[PDB]
Design a protein around this ligand. Structure first.
Ligand code: HEM
Ligand code: HEM
Lengths: 137, 137
């Protein structure tokens, strides 16, 4: 279930984080504009750039902490507030987060593995609700 | 405290994992015999290897999960059993684990960050006890 999926992802967090983040950019290529240093770089080039593996791992670490603090896939409002208030997220809207979760769920469904994809979709939906409540447009 | 420290480490895991693992190898250089291609290299050479940082991160990803699943610094027996049964750990004894935790605690005490080093000492001793209860020599 969802708690085991947090353990699966955490066990190899850097690999999964890079794979899901690239699935997100490759499904929604216009999102790459937010990461000016990733423009024009192949997947293997990105994995040679310190900030790429460090960015993706730190993003997914925080995602897993939010996921683990949730109850029945409902995240804490304080965690949504952290995400809205980050200076790096100041220009984003909830649709940017929707796209990330659509890509994450698609990745899990296409994976060899028994992720609880439905729970990740519901977690993403509940997180988007919380982001909106916390002020994200 | 210990639970916070798990979050601190996870928030910069590749850096901390490498630094702690290097502290272990430098304190106990003959432990390199269990690994491949580490001898004859300085810290910066190790960090630039293809597999070194990734290995440390997989180790620390799992270590942090074992810490997080613990209650009062007591690991789950099932986590000890997994560590004993891993083929990669087939030749180890509990003394190898004790040395890793001695180096980890020394690193935390010497760091500028406010770790609960005594709880990590206790966790390591409890992990050694659980590894022995699970059959490691
Ligand atoms: C639940 C979802 C998300 C989480 C947990 C998250 C978390 C983070 C974290 C922890 C950082 C800082 C990493 C560091 O210390 O280097 C960061 C930076 C950033 N985030 Fe997010 N993020 C999320 C979603 C998004 C989305 C959907 C976008 C845009 C489409 C985005 C755009 C950015 C940008 C542009 C940065 C700064 C990149 C840089 O400094 O190079 N984030 N995010
Ligand atoms: C709680 C402490 C430890 C944890 C959490 C841990 C975890 C791991 C993990 C996750 C792997 C890799 C599994 C894989 O992806 O293939 C691994 C491999 C390995 N571990 Fe440990 N380990 C610990 C302690 C130790 C100690 C103390 C030693 C020896 C001094 C050691 C020796 C090895 C070796 C030799 C490998 C195989 C490396 C390779 O072939 O690339 N481990 N460990």
């Amino acid at each position: 279930g969802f708690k085991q999926d947090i353990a699966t992802l955490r066990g190899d967090l850097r690999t999964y984080a890079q794979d899901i983040f690239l699935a997100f950019l490759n499904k929604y290529p216009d999102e790459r504009r937010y990461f000016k240093n990733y423009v024009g770089k192949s997947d293997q080039e990105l994995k040679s750039m310190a900030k790429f593996g460090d960015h993706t791992e730190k993003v997914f670490n925080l995602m897993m902490e939010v996921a683990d603090r949730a109850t029945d896939c409902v995240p804490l409002a304080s965690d949504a507030n952290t995400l809205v208030q980050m200076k790096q997220h100041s220009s984003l809207t909830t649709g940017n987060f929707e796209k990330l979760f659509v890509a994450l769920v698609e990745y899990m469904r296409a994976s060899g593995q028994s992720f609880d994809s439905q729970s990740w979709d519901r977690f993403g939906k509940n997180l988007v609700s919380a982001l909106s409540s916390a002020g994200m447009k």
